[PDB]
Amino acid sequence: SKKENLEVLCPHLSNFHHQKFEDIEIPGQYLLNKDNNVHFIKIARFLPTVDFVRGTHSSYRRLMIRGHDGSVHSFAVQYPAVRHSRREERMFQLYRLFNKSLSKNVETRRRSIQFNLPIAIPLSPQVRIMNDSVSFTTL
Amino acid sequence: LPPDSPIFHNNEPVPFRLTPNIQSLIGDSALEGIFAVNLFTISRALIEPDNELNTYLALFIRDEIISWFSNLHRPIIENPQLREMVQTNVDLIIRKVAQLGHLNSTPTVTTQFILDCIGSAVSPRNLARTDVNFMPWF
Amino acid sequence: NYEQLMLIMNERTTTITNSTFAVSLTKNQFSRLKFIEQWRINK
Amino acid sequence: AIFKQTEPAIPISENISTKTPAPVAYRSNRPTITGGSAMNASALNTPATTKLPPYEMDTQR
Amino acid sequence: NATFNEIIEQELPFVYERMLEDSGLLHVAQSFLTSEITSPNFAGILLRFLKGKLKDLGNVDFNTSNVLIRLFKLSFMSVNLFPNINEVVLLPHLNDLILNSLKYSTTAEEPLVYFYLIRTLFRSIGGGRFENLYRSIKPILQVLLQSLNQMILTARLPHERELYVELCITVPVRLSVLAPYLPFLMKPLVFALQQYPDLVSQGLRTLELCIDNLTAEYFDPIIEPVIDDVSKALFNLLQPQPFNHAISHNVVRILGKLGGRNRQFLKPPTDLTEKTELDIDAIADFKINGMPEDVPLSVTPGIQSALNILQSYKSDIHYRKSAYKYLTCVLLLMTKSSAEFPTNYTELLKTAVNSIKLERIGIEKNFDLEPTVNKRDYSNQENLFLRLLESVFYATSIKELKDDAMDLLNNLLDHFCLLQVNTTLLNKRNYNGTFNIDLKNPNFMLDSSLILDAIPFALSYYIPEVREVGVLAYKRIYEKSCLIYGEELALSHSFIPELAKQFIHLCYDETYYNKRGGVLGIKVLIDNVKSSSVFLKKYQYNLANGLLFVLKDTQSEAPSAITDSAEKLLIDLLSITFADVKEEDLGNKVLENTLTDIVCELSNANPKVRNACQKSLHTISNLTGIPIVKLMDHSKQFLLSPIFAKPLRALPFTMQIGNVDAITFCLSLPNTFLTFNEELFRLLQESIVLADA
Amino acid sequence: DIGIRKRFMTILDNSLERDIKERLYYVIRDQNWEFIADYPWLNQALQLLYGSFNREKELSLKNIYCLSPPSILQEYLPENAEMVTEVNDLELSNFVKGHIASMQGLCRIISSDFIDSLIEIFYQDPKAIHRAWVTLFPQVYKSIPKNEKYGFVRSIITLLSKPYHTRQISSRTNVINMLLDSISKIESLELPPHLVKYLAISYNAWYQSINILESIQSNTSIDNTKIIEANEDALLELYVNLQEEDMFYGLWRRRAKYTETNIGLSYEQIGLWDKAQQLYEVAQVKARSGALPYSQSEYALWEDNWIQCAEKLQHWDVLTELAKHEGFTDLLLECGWRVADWNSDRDALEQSVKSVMDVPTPRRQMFKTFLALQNFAESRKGDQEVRKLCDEGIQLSLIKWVSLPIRYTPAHKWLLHGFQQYMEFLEATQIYANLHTTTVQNLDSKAQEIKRILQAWRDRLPNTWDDVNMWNDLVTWRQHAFQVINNAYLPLIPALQAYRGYHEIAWVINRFAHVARKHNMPDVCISQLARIYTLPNIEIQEAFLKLREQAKCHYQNMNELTTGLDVISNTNLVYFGTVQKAEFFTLKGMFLSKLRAYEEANQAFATAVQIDLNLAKAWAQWGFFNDRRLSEEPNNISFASNAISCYLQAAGLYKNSKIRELLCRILWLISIDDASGMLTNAFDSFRGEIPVWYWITFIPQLLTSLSHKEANMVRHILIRIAKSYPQALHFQLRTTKEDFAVIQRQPWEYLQELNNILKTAYPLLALSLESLVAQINDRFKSTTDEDLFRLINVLLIDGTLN
């Protein structure tokens, strides 16, 4: 089944927004260096019917999160995340640090050049969540 | 460098991945006017701002050096000699980046080193000398 | 035949003003480089 | 802080009456940047409504 | 005036009931309040009469609602006709008018009359002083307007979306720009510019009021989540002179007042269309007389157009009937290559249905691979069949298209009932060997489980005349599944278990349409299956949690019949499943969990689910002879220990209310929970003794 | 009206023959669609072609792999099956056979009902006509045999070149789009004459033509070398009309024959117009006296791109006499020509406008509107036809906007600039009308409106990466509008007895002279700081940006730093400010440290930093100077403490900026292994508020710094992060805490201290985040088949790798 229910899989996250009593933010908004803090998107609720995605060499589950501004953010749960994730995320951090030099130069700003890194935020040192929309493919 | 371990080198025959299928997707006009020119202007924009490449690449190389000496179990080489390893690798990476965005004093086509690189990354005499998991046909 | 069919509208236009005059009157060499050279000589 | 002063109020018209221009048989085969025009805007130096230029087939009897 | 007031106050109900027969008598009341020295007095009498008549403004017929709306319109025009003479008659019961319209539209039968009244009140004023007592209502009004603006994902759309976006913009304010509650206006501004060409000249004006005096620092992060939609709808309004220049030169003035700010927030396009099921080709062979062989061309070049023809109630009926015939042509072409049946299908169906009750069916093993699925084309064909089936369901909402739609729907439903037995027979490939890898499967087809996405679509749809067709569809597949299986196993292997799980999943969705579809499916399910005590007692915990989640999660502006029907269904289900329990200490696995989920929710933030849990604890202590304090013997600590641990000072208000209400219900019970909660009483009395400023 | 329409179409169908070739030749050659020319007639054309079909009851899809049939699926019960033998006494047995007989007649689909039910979809929606034509026409083109394709493609050119298509110009769904799209799906006739495709741009058809013109670049159509170059000409002109310049430069230097053309086009794409201009001159010289024929298309490229580079470099005195040498509206494009009057030669511009303001463009219409505005300006009680010329210009620009594609192209940016120009024309009308009634010396009563509109103009300027022609056009026409008010306040100067003569032209010079320095044009950035001497007084803000930009001019091209040294070192009189001398002194520090100088540059930075202690650029440059002195030695010398102190001072009041490289320098210079505690003193004696929010982006490099020794000054930063921004640290803290907890002292002690500070302050937040993370960690664990799948995949890639 390509679409499995969240309240069957994890009933705490389908019941989250009732027993939540503060403003949690969407994780991974501090990695993208957006100067202030007031316009960050707060998690409204977890959507039901999460997706089971079979890849080429593995498979994972994609859970969707409704934001407080009406937007839906999809994340991929890599449950056996391989232990070279810290080197990956440090390269992601390094190449996201260069995106501000690539917007003050006029020639890279006319052509709208940015580096487009993925936002992967680790939860435990076994599981990380990565941003993953549908209509992402590999070659 | 009196030590010898970290170098940050590339093993592949091709300088990057520009396979036949990607090159037929991008085309001829966009490979000449969009691919190479953006690849030139990125490296031009990174060496302009008066050593920001140095400041980022220093600690982001140093963590890689520490992980390199901690993966293999010899973490005892902790000294300013490690800072010499870091500065050597940083100068190597900065030299290879500034090689792309250098326009000559003589009149020469900008994106010429980049065009020679894409000439050496798409030739079948280089793509055949790589592994089959690279999929050089695709 | 075919080569004369595939070039029916291939008529060159020097400039917008000449195109304007050509469409207006129907209803009613390296001189540039030489000019730039002689103007650089005159200064 | 939150508010700035009053902008100049530009009064748009209420009963303007312009003419829709007739199409023109324009011709521009220059392939250079600025399209054989003084400036390179290429949207400001192009007529509004155009049509196809006159041509003729092979008059080879 | 002092005698005319008591004459008209004693006579106004009789004048009103005379207005419901001869409607010209409105010209009486108009002539009392359009030109008088005693116009504020009659405006006060009329407003105090209409304040009482407002509660039944929704639940009356067309004539009475028309008369009441005209009296309200006259009473509002009397205000802006005499501004310096008393408009102070309107400023009391003005916020009560807004609030009671929003509250009474919940339980109303025709709930759009209240928002038409709010629109008339907003269009009657603007340019006055009493918009400062109204500024204490703006956040509640704008949250109730945006959460009614986008929650109509199945919007009725006569003017419903237009009405809500007309209400959300064009709210009055004495200040030039309205409030810090401007991000509430950004989502209706996109709809006002984009989709309704009669709202456009309103919304453009709102943009100018934000662009002219907002400092361009405070305003730019506000329009940031909507700047691509705003600029893309603004660029559609840049059209020449046959299009209206009064709303094109507005856009030119806006984009000229923004220097580089009209183009500094646009990136390369992230909205490239990727050829969905309304864009793909389903190719068949056609015999053309000028050709030697048949030629393959697509049967679906006009599917999106025919769907837009069928959904619109302003086209012809010839065009609508031909569109329906086209969609059923494409659907029956997709259904044709499974509509052939073998010569011995009856004995094969009987063999395959009594072969389910056997254990250890031997599987012949073979070693050969099957081709893969090609998920994109499978998903497009699956969604295409789903859209065509949903339009067959929608076609029953139209007169003179209903009879053949119902006949074709009956044929399709008892076709899918006969095709479900193949899925049942192939689900025994998941058994008979805990890890078999050498078996044979038919490769990849539309698995006849897409009636599990069409019948919950028909129940969640915004026309009730197709929700009736959805429940008739469920009754028909119940009859056919009980026919071809038998009642003892149609509740464990046919559609009836599977689709029932779908109904529980409709209770967890994020809009009130799907919750109504879920409680509709649950009510027809528990009206069908009551003769057997294995299904409703096996599925009791999940059904109770679904009907409880309808009570917890439902927005306040959703209609009242959702939570009322959910409460009635929960009480009826607990009356059914707790009828056989006679032992006072009888709980094995699932009665313990049902009582746990009930009594752990007496301390909720929502008062509806608190009162529903109290009522359900009362109707299962009057059903069987068990005290309420015997029902809470095992799960009382899971209710009390979260309350006694948190000190009731850092919690928000709705949780303090829930904890205090749960402890009040526990203390009102006979002789239980007397132990050492003095610290909570001391902290609550010291939290209520002080001021709240 | 359905009855008469159906009767007309059925007698037109019965008149023709039932062959597809005859009906295709009827809809292309024979029928004259000039009367139905506003309506999509392809509808009617489809109704003729669908007349040639057969009514076949065996219509069946072959592409869908449809739903599960009961034929083979009741044979998927392999050997354990007690087959029942003729049980026929039920209600099931008649229901099944009645359903079989029902579904037999229901799924017999003829071609007739599909065809004639699709026909009436065409009369409501014109997008079923588009899709139906694009699916049908490449299939019925196969009926046209060989030795007849030439006449068919010639009839296609005759159909597309008809003059009655102008009744569908103002539409997004023309028949030309619906027909060119079906041309593009054929690849046999998909070469039409291809200057027709570039001229079928009177319609929209942009990408329907780019598809056709790019499917000849990748076709073996090499019959001529003059078909290919004309194809490339039409493609480059479509790229120019869409302002897609990168594809223009790529296609040009893929097709060019000279090498200096390639070098000049590359320098022109980058934005170096001096070297590109020199290379175009070299390529023009070698064609006069060479052995190459230059193809008559590179020659125009050399001429026009020379003119464009000379326009960007602002050599208007050359181009004025170049446009005097030949009849051209390059002469009109010196609207800014080092001009202060525009009135002594008013007639010489009116005749040049009026001779060319037929077949009008938005630019020449803008020139006509500016002439009317100047007529209202220099002669009060003017015309107020400016309110009419602006409106006809707005309507012309709207026709040009609808002629472009729907989605935003780079060509729309100039239309947006034209909208801003018309709105500034109307505001200049208001300014001049207020300027004509202040003749009674009513100053400080109507000057407030002028100040408000000028303040609105100061904040309304283009983006800094926009074209320098856009910036130059806005600057020149604002200089015209300022010259009018400076001329009209000129009689009212001595009758006042600072003053209301503004001359804030310097602002729109300085803001221009800044942005050209952003565009790497230093020659015009020096040359624009010479039109500032029109008034000999030293102003509080003209001298500020003037001296700052002139000192920033001489910062690169290191044979020029002495020219920045000698201009600041002799200027000691204050130009209305005590902050300008501090930046002067630290610029002396930059210029002295750029050459090899050890102590005097340190003295220059010291005297730059003692005066105010409020310029963070001086602290940042002193830190850079100390790092440049550090780079010739190992980093363990206590001289680095001065560097980290100037860096920490350079991040405290340099806030809301790019300060993260200073934080990188702090994190790298702190990590030295000095035994003397001077660096910890230099960190811990910093008097100022540390930028806690900008330390978030190095939270991993802080959290791995606790494991490294000589780092407990990282703890103050992490504590100030955890008490103010608690959601940034939480996931990283739990991840590295459960990393260090399973490998088991200051690392875990510091991690438990940070976790305790994050748990006491904000306890509800930590509780909810830990419950969320724990539920994801326990419930999203993969099943058995997914683990087996990933195990077999890693085994298979290792087997094929070994």
Mutant choice from D4, D7, D52, D56 vs F, greatest count of F C-beta within 10 A: D52
Q: Which amino acid is at F65?
A: Y
- Contact residues on chain C for D38, CB-CB shorter than 8 A: 16
Report which residue type is found at A66: R
* CA E454/CA E466 separation, integer angstroms: 12
Looking at chain D, which subunits does it touch, using at least 3 CB pairs closer than 8 Å as the criterion?
C, E, F
Q: What is the dihedral of CA F543, F545, F550, F554, to 10 degrees?
A: 140
- Among E137, E45, E34, which Cα is nearest to E79's? E34
Please calculate the CA angle B49-B52-B58 and round it to the nearest 5 degrees: 160
Which residue of chain A comes nearest to F728, CA vs CA? A30
User: Of F307, F319, F420, F476, which to mutate for an interface test with D (greatest number of D Cβ within 10 Å)?
Assistant: F307
Look at C8 and F157 and tell me if their CB atoms are within 8 Å: yes
How far apart (Å, rounded) are the C-alpha atoms in residues F639 and F662? 17
Cα separation, F418 vs B99, in Å, equals 41
Q: Does F244 touch chain A (CB under 8 A)?
A: no
Q: Residue E444: count other Cβ atoms within 10 Å of its Cβ.
A: 14
* Contact present, F248 and F289 (Cβ < 8 Å): no
Q: How far is CA F535 from CA E604, F500, F542, F543, in A?
A: 76, 14, 11, 12
Decide: F586 and F607 in contact? Cβ < 8 Å. no
Cα gap F430→E651, rounded to integer Å: 59
Is some CB atom of chain A closer than 8 A to the CB atom of B39? no
CA distance F300 to F501: 48
Residue A20 DSSP class:
-
- CA-wise closest residue to F425 among F449, F457, F382: F457
Flag if F271 and A106 touch (Cβ within 8 Å): yes
Nearest-CA distance F246 → chain B (Å) = 5
Phi, psi of F187, rounded to the nearest 5 degrees: 65, 5
**Interchain CB distance below 8 Å, C11 and D58:** no
Q: Which two tokens stand for residue A39?
A: 């316009």
Q: CA-CA distance, C6 to E481, in Å (whole number)? A: 68
D12 contacts E249? CB cut-off 8 A: yes
- CA closest to B67 among chain A residues: A87
- Inter-chain residue contact A5 with E505, CB threshold 8 Å: yes
Q: Six-digit token pair at E340?
A: 């052939």
From the list C17, C24, C39, the residue facing F327 with the nearest CB is C17
- Determine, for residues A111 and B60 on separate chains, whether the beta-carbon distance falls below 8 Å: no
Euclidean distance between CA atoms F281 and F261, whole angstroms: 10
C-alpha span between C39 and D14 (Å, rounded): 52
- On the CB side of A24, CA atoms within 13 Å amount to 29
Alpha carbon separation from F677 to B80, F450, F644, F673, F706 (Å, rounded): 17, 62, 14, 10, 18
Task: Tell me the three state secondary structure of residue A130.
Answer: strand
Using an 8 Å CB-CB cutoff, list chain C residues near D55.
8-9
Contact F692, F720 (CB under 8 A): yes
Q: Which of A86, A97, A101 sits opposite B45 (nearest CB)?
A: A101
User: What gap in Å lies between CA F210 and CA F198, rounded to an integer?
Assistant: 8
Contact B50/F at CB under 8 A: yes
Task: Please tell me the distance in Å from C17's CA to the nearest CA on chain F.
Answer: 6
Distance from C-alpha of E628 to C-alpha of E622, rounded to nearest angstrom = 9
Beta carbons of F452 and D44 less than 8 Å apart: no
Distance from CA of F412 to the nearest CA of B (A): 20
Indicate the SS3 state at residue A73. strand
User: Nearest chain F Cα to B42, which residue?
Assistant: F270
State how far Cα E550 lies from the chain centre: 12
Residues E322, F121 contacting (CB under 8 angstroms) = yes
Whole-angstrom distance, CA of residue F664 vs CA of residue B55:
6
**Nearest of E452, E565, E573 to residue E502 by alpha carbon:** E452
H/E element holding A46? strand A43-46
Residue F217 dihedral angles phi and psi, to the nearest 5°: -65, -35
d(CA C9, CA A116): 45
Chains that touch F (3 or more CB pairs under 8 A): A, B, C, D, E
Q: Are C24 and F359 within 8 A, CB to CB?
A: yes
Per 3-state DSSP, chain D is made up of helix, strand and coil in percentages (nearest 5) of 0, 5, 95
| CB spacing of A79 vs F781 below 8 angstroms | yes
Least Cα distance to E149 among E205, E189, E90, E108 occurs for E189
Number of C-beta neighbours around residue E156 at 10 A: 11
The H-or-E segment that residue E167 falls in is helix E160-168
Task: Please tell me the distance from the alpha carbon of residue E365 to that of residue F14, in angstroms, as a whole number.
Answer: 62
Q: Do F322 and C23 touch (CB under 8 A)?
A: no
Shortest Cα–Cα distance, F577 to chain E (Å): 28
| Resolution at which this structure was determined, Å | 3.4
Which class for E678: exposed (0-12), middle (13-18), buried (19 or more C-beta within 10 A)?
exposed
Yes or no, beta carbons of E257 and D7 under 8 Å apart: yes
CB pair distance less than 8 Å for B29 and F672: no
CA E315 to each of CA D15, E32, E397, F121: distance values in angstroms, whole numbers, following the listed order: 35, 45, 15, 11
D58 → closest Cβ in C1, C10, C13: C1
Report the chain E residue with the minimal C-alpha distance to residue F72: E442
CB contact (8 A) between residue C8 and residue D55:
yes
Of E485, E569, E491, nearest in space to E529 by CA: E491
Nearest to C20 among F224, F285, F356 (CB): F356
Note every long-range contact of E628-631, with CB atoms under 8 Å and residues 24 or more positions apart, other chains counting.
Answer: E628/E669, E628/E670, E629/E669, E629/E670, E629/E671, E629/E672, E630/E584, E630/E585, E631/E595, E631/E599
- CB within 8 Å: D43 and F415: yes
Spatial CB neighbours of B132, under 8 Å, sequence gap ≥ 6: none
User: Chain D residue with minimal CA distance to F453?
Assistant: D8
Closest-approach residue (CA) in chain D for E240: D20
Do the chains contact at F727 and A110, CB–CB below 8 Å?
no
Spatial contact of A108 and A102, defined as CB atoms under 8 Å apart: yes
Region for E553 from its dihedrals, namely left if φ exceeds 0, alpha if ψ lies in -120 to 50, beta otherwise: beta
Residue of E16, E128, E29, E113 whose CA lies nearest to E80:
E128
Contact: chain C with chain D (3+ CB pairs below 8 Å): yes
C12/D30 Cβ within 8 A:
yes
Are the C-beta atoms of E187 and E146 separated by less than 8 Å? yes
Give CA–CA dist B89/A60, Å, rounded. 37
Establish if B42 touches chain F: CB-CB under 8 angstroms.
Answer: no
Tokens of E513: 């349409």
- CA C30 to chain centroid: 13
Cβ atoms E256, F462 nearer than 8 A: no
Angle at F617 between CA F615 and CA F621, to 5 degrees: 130
Q: What CA–CA distances, in Å, run from F359 to D34, E651, F436?
A: 18, 73, 35
Question: Tokens 């709930």 appear where?
Answer: E111
C and E touching (3 or more beta-carbon pairs closer than 8 Å)? no
Residue A129: φ, ψ to 5°: -105, 135
Closest CA–CA distance from residue D24 to any residue of chain C (Å): 8
Cβ of residue E257 closer than 8 Å to a chain D Cβ: yes
Q: Are B104 and B118 in contact (CB under 8 A)?
A: no
**Among the listed residues A71, A53, A72, A69, the one whose alpha carbon sits nearest the alpha carbon of residue A61:** A53
Touching chains F and D? (3+ Cβ pairs < 8 A)? yes
CA dihedral F542, F548, F551, F555 (to 10 degrees): -140
List, in sequence order, the alpha helices (H) in chain A: 6-9, 11-14, 16-19, 85-97, 101-104, 106-110
Helices (H), E287-317: 303-311
User: To the nearest whole angstrom, how far is the Cα of D28 from the nearest Cα of chain E?
Assistant: 25
Chain D residues touching residue E251 (CB < 8 angstroms): none
Q: How far apart are CA E337 and CA E400, in angstroms?
A: 29
Cβ of E345 within 8 Å of Cβ of F70? The answer is yes
Chain A and chain F share a number of CB contacts under 8 A equal to 106
SS3 for A128? strand
- What are E530's two structure tokens? 């009551």
Distance of residue D36 Cα from the nearest chain C Cα, in angstroms: 5
- The strand pair at A120-122 and A59-67 is best described as unpaired
Q: Which residues pair with E283 in a beta bridge?
A: E298
Contacts of E167 (CB under 8 A, 6+ apart): E115, E118, E119, E122, E145
Q: What residues of C are in contact with residue F193 (Cβ under 8 Å)?
A: 5-9
Instruction: Give me the residue from B28, B56, B83 closest to F661, CB to CB.
Output: B56
